[PDB]
């Protein structure tokens, strides 16, 4: 696994090491924050992150490095940066410069993550050079090579064999769409190239679902082979029960006029979406993600109002961190949700629900 | 702008999902109103077990009970059971089409029609025209209980026991089928000592005979079929004693029997409303399906014509330089 | 695609064999020809494709044919751009196609393998002058039974089985038995699941679904048709369960 | 072992458990029942129904109707009935005050029929809240 | 279509046909999904009259007698203005809507309305 | 618009305003088809507040006095935060929706609602 | 849209029609919203009346102009 | 549609298939509001069950034409 | 008249001799069949058919030629 620290990704759209996943959505949806909080999560894992920023404002490159230096992320991070003032050759070659640095560590047996902060602006920077070089264009004035641009870039990022040392390069390209036009020419290319896509929607960003992952449309071609055995057990129930809530989104206005087999599913699914809500730059450890999905997908949050589901899990995650530290050793070493730890977690829930009800 | 065309499809696809869940919420409610009648089925089975035998034991021309008492029909009341909410077929409209034709018929007879409106869609129609005599407006309800019905029974009882109003009749929608269920009019008061219940036109069913509605399936669809059930009336024991009088017991039975024909009329008008709505939300979710298909085809024509027109501007500029 | 095809027609012409060709997928053959043509400077056709798209596809697809020596049958994956079937890349592909096999994410969630959708998969071959009347009559009854059960899933969630009509109590029980008997164990999953696969011929398929739809096998349990090959193997799993339940 | 008793309203059956002693009001006024009671058909008044089973004894107000009794079986058909404990105690006596003023403003026959029928419905509703 | 050219009687009825068919044009998103059943009393009356205007706008042609077989009808403007006076005044609201389809005068719409009401 | 920059009092109401207007944006389709009566009383309440938020976002400008026809208003941030805390809490659910149109302060919206109650009598 | 506004008017028209643009624009929002509710209150039902009278002021026959006196 | 409709057909086809063209003009309107009405009277339930078997006239198998005597 | 043998044409959309008549529809809706059955019906008549297959499957044309051989067309 590549642990991003988000529950909505690391449970249901799991990114593994050696996988090219696509973070995609419209502007100001949280694409950079999905990529930045992934880099901020591997302070303890020994991956090396490359943050390539093509065509950005120079002020936002300085705010990312300020975010990285505060949280100790620059001890394992290279920031490749071509501000939009620079010529289009430097913006075209900036992810190839970042991918060459990430191939250095990958061939030295080290696992790596790379983020391209918009592949959309690289395609526009190669369209600029090509149209000035009088090369014949295509859809949206792009040349024929823009697929062969990004496919030559993203296929360099995968997982190596034990005959080479098993270095990985997990690419997380970010692509910005235009009014959700997934069928636009540069989103159409990278969705074909990339394994998984992480669809971020502004209709969930304004409603409070943050990070605004549209988990229904978002897919991962690696699938559950990325996840650890502890995560496969628990997130088998989160996927089914958020799919049962997806069929019953029309019924949420009509919760009273229904039987108890349906109304409990509406009551469960509205707390399973409260599991997915994380604030910015607060990534969760894998042990903290297994607690949150075990509590929610096994009936231990049905007593709570939606204002309190956020406050309960923060206090239950800091409870087991301090009071019951034997749980974290079961999941760090064995990496399986063992019958010992399922007993140890339930003792923490009924002691936290007793202390949370008093408050 | 293709974004406006994608928003139109995404709202019709939203409208199709809303009007389909409203079909299943109405499908749950007609089944819950099917169950509510069968809960009241032991009451009216036992009431007719009594009322057939009190008319059997009586055999006396001296016994006149004031809910069976026949006066001259100079005035006539009419309680109409409407819906509370819209978006249900032509349910409330064909009902008030039938109320208007009964208001019309009593003007040819010239015998002073009077209205009792139940339900918000009738409260509105009756209050809106003030040149129509209405006694009391009633809050219509889903899940009618004896308590909501008792109030209706009281207005019906107190308006009849005084000689101002004869022949309280009532029109409501019996739940016959899902798509077509015509509002038929009954004559509630004056009750018949026999207990026969009959329509204004002149067809009277024996009261031991009433039919329940059971919603089931035919070949593919969801249909409702009304199976007629005969309750056999046992013989009242020979040794049985009467407490007050066979006229004074019968004067307490008919408020029970008038309360029951009101509550069964509310619960069959309720299932007719909720199945007119299920028919309307079925036709709306299938019109929105036929709409969403031709919006997806007209989008793809405009999508493809946009790309073809966009490149031909670019290939023209690439040659012109 | 052509290189793959040239190997496939050596086995057809010279070894007189019957070959499968697999193009995964045929859209990337289209977009690679669209990219070369744009690099060659060709004025593009409608919706951005190459102007030679009808013949570039036709050059690959007309070599895929049954000769007198052998045949090559190609099962080629198809990507639909923008979910538009009138797009020139599927519209030129679907003209050459002769059957479509729709695989279903929803049927894999139930556990049915192979997760082929029975109702959205089509063929031009399922005509009674081609497959015969005994196969054409039975494939329509299976589709009409599975289409009626697809309609009744909202009614079973409202009424339940005991309130449905007796004619429709069967078309749920038979259709739930068809959805199981459509599943099958595979030889390529004998390491993955352990259960040995079954090659089921066309002769045993039609005789299988004749028994389920004629109602003779309405005494068997549902989970006697799941992952069985033949219809005799269905009753064998059932008589095992009657001998396993009594213990 | 005794008589069984059912009290059934036009939509809902309230009682169906075996009891030993009921004492129903009626248009006569008061009738006690023990098992092996000869079959009798009475009319019941709009008043309380005090029931004594094994240990605890309680009252369920009923709003009048018909009570016939047979071979140790009492079916009671009543057009509205509420248990004497499940009415909240003071809240009926507010609703009694809503009726007591409404007969003071009663005028005409139909308002003197409707108030006095609902007053006796309400006055025998409070008398179960205390019993 | 200006009152100093066509007359004032012709111009005020060409407006009222177009005000009716515009209002029914706007209602075909409400009646596309919900149908006619949710329209108000006024909007149903505008739907009812505009559904009769659209069929009386149609006409059999002399040239089209080899397609349909029905004979064509020349309709003068004095017949045309009085035929739409009757639909907009509502004096022919009792007639069926198919009585107005492919008839020359409004008299032929009346004579066709008899046969649809007569034949049983 | 982050709590490390503006504080969590500004930020929690800036989310609840955007959640209310997003919720009303989703509903404009089905209130056009099915009406306001089909909504739940929770959804009729968030519709009615988003009617009042959208009016209260409007403001008379000093430069737009030849377009609004009314004098402009400078509104402070504390007056802005105080006003949207009142529309969201529900303490202003009795005022009409036009009371919040082109007002500066939330004291101007209530004083406009007093004039609309007096002129209703007149 | 007029990008000059009430500077392009006399003082008499600015005193009367100075708010008429934004009142009809806000009425036309609420008339389209008043079709979505069955039973609507009087403070809406008054403004639906005043808004439909302000629309009837604005209709004219062709080439029959109103003087600024007749317009105020 | 066909531009030479009646000019092409022979006099047996002009006489007999003229009643065919008017019945499907009737049956196209009768399939509408068939499930809406659902209480099919014998002025309609005959004319619908006639119209379903008019389609059964029109079904032919592939590669099997019918002669003009057989069509009439 | 030019008789197609399909009852739905020859009664209701009748094609005369000298007429251009369009056979128009989506893919796999029997367009080749209406054209083929019209050619098969011209056995008795002194009508020479010409079938032009533009850009089609060679397997599809070979089926049509064999269906013409099989039926003497
Ligand atoms: N989980 C979250 N919770 C709350 N706010 C968030 C979250 N993620 C991101 N944001 C905020 O949303 C805003 C946009 O996020 P971000 O900068 O990541 O957008 P983006 O997708 O990179 O858009 P652009 O490419 O246009 O900059 C930022 O101000 C950020 O603080
Ligand atoms: N009248 C008919 N009766 C029975 N089967 C038919 C009939 N007409 C066509 N078919 C069958 O329908 C299928 C499609 O017909 P056909 O190939 O003639 O149409 P098409 O539109 O030309 O197809 P394509 O567009 O793929 O070339 C054929 O396999 C044929 O066997
Ligand atoms: Mg960004
Ligand atoms: Mg063909």
Query: Across the interface, do B86 and G38 touch by the CB < 8 Å criterion?
Result: yes
Dist. CA B83–CA B118, nearest whole Å: 8
Best of C39, C43, C81 to disrupt the A interface (most A CBs within 10 Å) is C39
Domain that residue D129 falls in? 88-131
Of the candidates A207, A253, A280, which has its C-beta nearest F19's C-beta?
A207
Respond yes or no on whether the N-terminal peptide bond of residue C25 is cis (omega within 30° of 0): yes
Co-location of D63 and D100 in the same domain: no
Dist. CA F23–CA F49, nearest whole Å: 11
Respond yes or no on whether the N-terminal peptide bond of residue B156 is cis (omega within 30° of 0): no
Q: Which atom of ligand 1 is nearest to the CA of A28?
A: 23
For B281, name the nearest residue in chain F, comparing CA atoms only: F34
Co-location of A238 and A188 in the same domain: no
Co-location of A26 and A144 in the same domain: yes
Annotated binding site of A for ATP: 25-32
Contacts of E67 in chain H (CB under 8 A): 1, 5
Bridge partners (DSSP) listed for residue A83: A56
Residues of chain I numbered 26-55 and touching chain H (CB < 8 Å): 30, 33, 36-38, 40-41
Q: Which residues of C touch A (CB under 8 A)?
A: 28, 31, 34-41, 44, 48, 79, 81-82, 109
| Distance from the alpha carbon of residue B307 to the mean position of ligand 4, in angstroms | 29
- What is the length of chain G? 72
For atom 21 of ligand 2, the residue with the nearest CA is I28
B183, containing H or E segment: strand B183-187
Tell me how far the alpha carbon of residue A272 is from its chain's centroid. 17
Joined tokens for residue C139: 């494939």
For H43, name the nearest residue in chain E, comparing CA atoms only: E120
Burial class (CB in 10 A: 0-12, 13-18, 19+), A137: buried
Domain final position from A192, A210, A227: A227
Nearby residues of C67 by Cβ (< 8 Å), 6 or more positions away: C12, C13
Q: I59 in ligand 2 pocket by Cβ < 6 Å?
A: no
Query: Across the interface, do E66 and H7 touch by the CB < 8 Å criterion?
Result: yes
Q: Are B53 and B235 within 8 A, CB to CB?
A: yes
Joined tokens for residue A234: 């628990």
Nearby residues of E105 by Cβ (< 8 Å), 6 or more positions away: E73, E75, E79, E83
Domain that residue C159 falls in? 126-247
What is the CATH number for A274?
1.20.150.20
Contacts of B278 in chain C (CB under 8 A): none
Bridge partners (DSSP) listed for residue D4: D73
Residue owning tokens 């008319």 = B55
Bridge partners (DSSP) listed for residue A79: A51
Co-location of A115 and A205 in the same domain: yes
Respond yes or no on whether the N-terminal peptide bond of residue C114 is cis (omega within 30° of 0): yes
Per DSSP, the residues of A6-68 read -HHHHTTS---TT-BEEEEESTTSSHHHHHHHHHHHTTSS--EEEEEEEEE-HHHHHHHHHHH
Co-location of D57 and D25 in the same domain: yes
Query: Across the interface, do F69 and G22 touch by the CB < 8 Å criterion?
Result: yes
Bridge partners (DSSP) listed for residue B158: none
Nearby residues of B130 by Cβ (< 8 Å), 6 or more positions away: none
Question: Does G60 touch chain F if contact means CB atoms closer than 8 Å?
Answer: no
Query: Across the interface, do A251 and B25 touch by the CB < 8 Å criterion?
Result: yes
Burial class (CB in 10 A: 0-12, 13-18, 19+), B257: buried
| Distance from the alpha carbon of residue A327 to the mean position of ligand 4, in angstroms | 68
What is the CATH number for A58?
3.40.50.300
Q: A280 in ligand 1 pocket by Cβ < 6 Å?
A: yes
- What is the length of chain H? 72
Is residue A268 part of the annotated active site? The answer reads: no
Q: Which of F9, F108, F120, F114 is nearest to F58 (CA)?
A: F108
Q: Beta strands of chain C (E only): which ranges?
A: 18-23, 71-76, 99-100, 122-123
Per DSSP, the residues of C125-160 read S-STTTS-HHHHHHHHHHHHHHHHHHHTHHHHTTT-
Dist. CA A39–CA F92, nearest whole Å: 46
Question: Does H41 touch chain B if contact means CB atoms closer than 8 Å?
Answer: no
Co-location of D62 and D106 in the same domain: no
Query: Across the interface, do E67 and H5 touch by the CB < 8 Å criterion?
Result: yes
Question: Does A207 touch chain F if contact means CB atoms closer than 8 Å?
Answer: yes
Size of interface A-C (CB pairs under 8 A): 31
Q: Are A38 and A73 within 8 A, CB to CB?
A: no
Dist. CA G13–CA H72, nearest whole Å: 81
Q: Are B84 and B140 within 8 A, CB to CB?
A: yes
Q: A178 in ligand 1 pocket by Cβ < 6 Å?
A: no
Query: Across the interface, do B242 and D41 touch by the CB < 8 Å criterion?
Result: yes
Q: Which ligand is nearest to the Cα of residue I67, counting in written order?
A: 2
Co-location of A9 and A31 in the same domain: yes
Dist. CA G44–CA D1, nearest whole Å: 69
| Distance from the alpha carbon of residue C182 to the mean position of ligand 2, in angstroms | 28
What is the CATH number for C169?
1.10.1140.10
Co-location of A234 and A190 in the same domain: no
Range A306-332 burial, b when 16+ CB lie within 10 A, else e: eebbeebbeebbebbeeeeeebbebbe
Query: Across the interface, do C38 and A144 touch by the CB < 8 Å criterion?
Result: yes
Pure H helices in E1-120: 3-6, 8-26, 30-33, 41-56, 77-89, 106-118
Dist. CA E44–CA E29, nearest whole Å: 14
Q: I32 in ligand 2 pocket by Cβ < 6 Å?
A: yes
Q: Which atom of ligand 2 is nearest to the CA of C124?
A: 29
Q: Which residues of B touch D (CB under 8 A)?
A: 36, 39-40, 42-44, 46-47, 50, 144-147, 149-150, 153-155, 157-159, 161-162, 164, 236-237, 239-244, 248-249, 251-253, 255-256, 259-260, 263
Co-location of D25 and D70 in the same domain: yes
CA distances in angstroms from C175 to A359, B143, C141, C222, E45, listed in the order given: 54, 37, 10, 10, 49
Q: C66 in ligand 2 pocket by Cβ < 6 Å?
A: no
Q: Which ligand is nearest to the Cα of residue A23, counting in written order?
A: 1
SS3 state at B256: helix
Give how many domains chain E has, as a whole number: 1
Q: Which of A255, A206, A193, A219 is nearest to A14 (CA)?
A: A219
Q: Are E69 and H19 within 8 A, CB to CB?
A: no
Contacts of I17 in chain H (CB under 8 A): 8
Domain that residue A21 falls in? 1-227
Nearby residues of A13 by Cβ (< 8 Å), 6 or more positions away: A21, A196, A198, A213, A215, A218, A219, A220
| Distance from the alpha carbon of residue I37 to the mean position of ligand 4, in angstroms | 13
Of the candidates H4, H20, H65, which has its C-beta nearest I19's C-beta?
H4
Co-location of A211 and A331 in the same domain: no
Joined tokens for residue H29: 């309107």
For atom 10 of ligand 1, the residue with the nearest CA is A30
Give how many domains chain A has, as a whole number: 2
Residue owning tokens 């501007």 = B313
Q: Are B197 and B186 within 8 A, CB to CB?
A: yes
Question: Chains with 3 or more CB pairs closer than 8 angstroms to G?
Answer: B, F
Joined tokens for residue A352: 């936290």
Q: I63 in ligand 2 pocket by Cβ < 6 Å?
A: no
Give how many domains chain D has, as a whole number: 2
For atom 16 of ligand 2, the residue with the nearest CA is I30
CA distances in angstroms from B177 to C130, D46, F91, listed in the order given: 45, 39, 48
Co-location of D20 and D75 in the same domain: yes
Residues of chain A numbered 114-143 and touching chain B (CB < 8 Å): 136-141
Dist. CA C77–CA A159, nearest whole Å: 26
Dist. CA I6–CA H62, nearest whole Å: 10
Query: Across the interface, do C35 and A147 touch by the CB < 8 Å criterion?
Result: yes
Tell me how far the alpha carbon of residue D107 is from its chain's centroid. 28
Q: Are B89 and B59 within 8 A, CB to CB?
A: no
What values do phi and psi take at B212, rounded to 5?
A: -90, 155
- What is the length of chain I? 73
Dist. CA B272–CA B262, nearest whole Å: 15
| Distance from the alpha carbon of residue I53 to the mean position of ligand 2, in angstroms | 15
Annotated binding site of I for ATP: 25-32
């Amino acid at each position: 696994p590549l642990q991003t620290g988000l529950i909505a990704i690391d449970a249901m759209i799991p990114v593994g090491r050696g996988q090219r996943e696509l973070i995609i959505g419209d502007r100001q949806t949280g694409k950079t924050a999905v990529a930045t909080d992934t880099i901020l999560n591997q302070q303890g894992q020994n991956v090396i992150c490359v943050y390539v920023a093509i065509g950005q404002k120079a002020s936002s490159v300085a705010q990312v490095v300020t975010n990285f230096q505060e949280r100790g992320a620059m001890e394992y991070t290279i920031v490749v940066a071509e501000t939009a003032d620079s010529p289009a050759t430097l913006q075209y070659l900036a992810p190839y410069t970042g991918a060459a640095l990430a191939e250095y560590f990958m061939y030295r047996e080290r696992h790596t993550l790379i983020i391209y902060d918009d592949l959309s602006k690289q395609a526009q920077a190669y369209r600029q050079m090509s149209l000035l070089l009088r090369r014949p264009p295509g859809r949206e004035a792009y040349p024929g090579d823009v697929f062969y641009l990004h496919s030559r870039l993203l296929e360099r990022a995968a997982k190596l064999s034990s005959l080479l040392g098993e270095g990985s390069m997990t690419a997380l390209p970010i692509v910005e769409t235009q009014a959700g036009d997934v069928s636009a020419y540069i989103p159409t290319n990278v969705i074909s190239i990339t394994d998984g896509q992480i669809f971020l929607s502004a209709d969930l960003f304004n409603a409070g679902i943050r990070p605004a992952i549209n988990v229904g449309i978002s897919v991962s071609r690696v699938g559950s082979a990325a996840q650890i055995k502890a995560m496969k057990k628990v997130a088998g129930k989160l996927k089914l029960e958020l799919a049962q809530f997806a069929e019953l989104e029309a019924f949420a206005q009509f919760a009273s006029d229904l039987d108890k087999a349906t109304q409990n599913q509406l009551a469960r699914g509205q707390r399973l979406r409260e599991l997915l809500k994380q604030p910015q730059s607060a990534p969760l450890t894998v042990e903290e993600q297994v607690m949150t999905i075990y509590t929610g997908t096994n009936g231990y949050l049905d007593s709570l109002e939606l204002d309190q589901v956020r406050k309960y899990l923060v206090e239950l995650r800091t409870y087991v961190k301090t009071n019951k530290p034997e749980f974290q050793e079961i999941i760090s070493s064995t990496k399986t949700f063992t019958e010992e730890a399922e007993a140890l977690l339930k003792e923490a829930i009924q002691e936290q629900m007793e202390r949370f009800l008093l408050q | 702008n293709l974004r406006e065309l994608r928003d139109r499809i995404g709202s019709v696809k939203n409208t199709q999902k809303i009007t389909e869940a409203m079909k299943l919420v109405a499908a749950a409610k007609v089944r819950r109103a099917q169950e509510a009648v069968v809960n009241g089925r032991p009451f009216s089975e036992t009431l007719v077990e009594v009322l057939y035998n009190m008319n059997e034991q009586l055999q006396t021309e001296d016994v006149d009970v004031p809910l069976t008492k026949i006066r001259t029909v100079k005035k006539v009341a009419l309680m109409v059971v409407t819906g509370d909410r819209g978006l249900c077929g032509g349910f409330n409209n064909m009902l008030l089409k039938k109320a208007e034709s009964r208001i019309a018929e009593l003007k040819k007879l010239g015998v002073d029609y009077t209205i009792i409106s139940i339900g918000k869609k009738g409260n509105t129609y009756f209050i809106r025209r003030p040149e129509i005599p209405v006694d009391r407006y009633f809050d219509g309800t889903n899940l009618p209980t004896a308590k909501e019905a008792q109030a209706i029974a009281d207005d019906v009882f107190s308006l009849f026991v005084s000689e101002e109003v004869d022949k309280v009749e009532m029109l409501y929608t019996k739940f016959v089928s899902l798509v077509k269920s015509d509002p038929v009019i009954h004559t509630l008061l004056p009750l018949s000592p026999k207990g026969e219940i009959c329509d204004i036109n002149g067809k009277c069913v024996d009261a031991a005979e009433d039919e329940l509605f059971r919603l089931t399936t035919k070949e593919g669809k969801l249909t409702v079929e009304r199976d007629m059930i005969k309750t056999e009336t046992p013989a009242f024991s020979p040794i049985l004693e009467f407490e007050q009088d066979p006229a004074q017991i019968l004067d307490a039975l008919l408020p029970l029997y008038l309360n029951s024909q009101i509550l069964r009329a509310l619960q069959e008008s309720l299932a007719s409303e909720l199945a007119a709505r299920m028919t309307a939300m079925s036709n709306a979710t299938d019109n929105a399906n036929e709409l969403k298909k031709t919006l997806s085809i007209n989008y793809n024509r405009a999508r493809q014509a946009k790309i073809t027109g966009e490149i031909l501007e670019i290939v023209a500029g690439a040659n012109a330089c | 695609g052509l290189t793959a095809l040239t190997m496939a027609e050596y086995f057809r012409d010279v070894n007189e064999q019957d070959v499968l060709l697999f193009i995964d997928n045929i859209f990337r053959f289209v977009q690679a020809g669209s990219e070369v043509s744009a690099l060659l400077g060709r004025m593009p056709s409608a919706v951005g494709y190459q102007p030679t798209l009808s013949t570039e596809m036709g050059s690959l697809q007309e070599r895929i044919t049954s000769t007198k020596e052998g045949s090559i049958t190609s099962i080629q994956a198809v990507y639909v751009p923008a979910d538009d079937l009138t797009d020139p890349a599927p519209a030129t592909t679907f003209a050459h196609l002769d059957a479509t096999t729709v695989l279903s994410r929803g049927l894999a969630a139930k556990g049915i393998y192979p997760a082929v959708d029975p109702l959205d998969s089509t063929s031009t071959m399922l005509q009674p002058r081609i497959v015969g009347e005994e196969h054409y009559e039975i494939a329509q009854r299976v589709k009409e039974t599975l289409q009626r059960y697809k309609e009744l899933q909202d009614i079973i969630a409202i009424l339940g089985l005991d309130e449905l009509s007796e004619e429709d109590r069967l078309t749920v029980a038979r259709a739930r038995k068809i959805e199981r008997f459509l599943s099958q164990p595979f030889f390529v999953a004998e390491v993955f699941t352990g259960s040995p696969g079954k090659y089921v011929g066309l002769a045993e398929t039609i005789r299988g679904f004749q028994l389920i739809l004629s109602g003779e096998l309405d005494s068997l349990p549902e989970q006697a048709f799941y992952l069985v090959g033949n219809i005799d193997e269905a009753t064998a799993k059932a008589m095992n369960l009657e001998m396993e339940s009594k213990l | 072992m005794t008589l069984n008793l059912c009290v059934l309203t036009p939509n809902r059956s309230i009682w169906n458990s075996e009891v030993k002693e009921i004492i129903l009001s009626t248009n006569s006024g008061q009738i006690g029942v023990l098992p092996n009671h000869a079959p009798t058909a009475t009319a019941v008044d709009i008043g309380i129904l005090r029931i004594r089973l094994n240990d605890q004894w309680l009252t369920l107000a009923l709003m009048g109707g018909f009570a016939r009794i047979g071979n140790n079986e009492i079916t009671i058909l009543v057009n509205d009935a509420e248990r004497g404990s499940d009415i909240d105690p003071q809240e009926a006596q507010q609703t009694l005050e809503i009726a007591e003023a409404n007969l003071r403003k009663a005028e005409g026959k139909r308002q003197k029929i409707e108030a006095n029928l609902a007053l006796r419905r309400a006055r025998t509703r409070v008398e179960a809240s205390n019993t």
